[PDB]
């Protein structure tokens, strides 16, 4: 039980880290393709700096 609970925390931590990764951390799964399929730019990327 302790092993599994710690595993759950570790999974949550990796998922949290992964959301902040790339390219400008966002809902990257579809958003990058959705950004180029229209003549647009992701807002979070405009506010990168």
């Amino acid at each position: 039980v302790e092993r599994d609970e710690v595993a759950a925390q570790k999974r949550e931590l990796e998922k949290q880290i992964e959301r902040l990764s790339q390219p400008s951390g966002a809902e990257d799964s579809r958003m990058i393709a959705l950004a180029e399929r229209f003549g647009g730019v992701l807002l979070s990327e405009i506010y990168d700096d």
Binding site: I17, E18, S21, Q22, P23, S24, D28
Partner: protein, 49 residues
């Protein structure tokens, strides 16, 4: 290097050699996506070894 090159004067040899290392900032965006995507394989390889 910057300070002492300014102090003595002249076209610094060391600055001239590594020009890109001095004038260009390093960008992480291009990389960390692929480090995270690569992670599952890295762990598996290390475990196998």
């Amino acid at each position: 290097r910057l300070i002492e090159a300014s102090l003595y004067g002249g076209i610094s040899s060391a600055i001239t050699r590594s020009l890109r290392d001095y004038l260009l900032p390093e960008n992480s965006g291009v990389r960390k996506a692929f480090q995270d995507m690569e992670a599952a394989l890295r762990e598996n390889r290390i475990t196998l070894e």
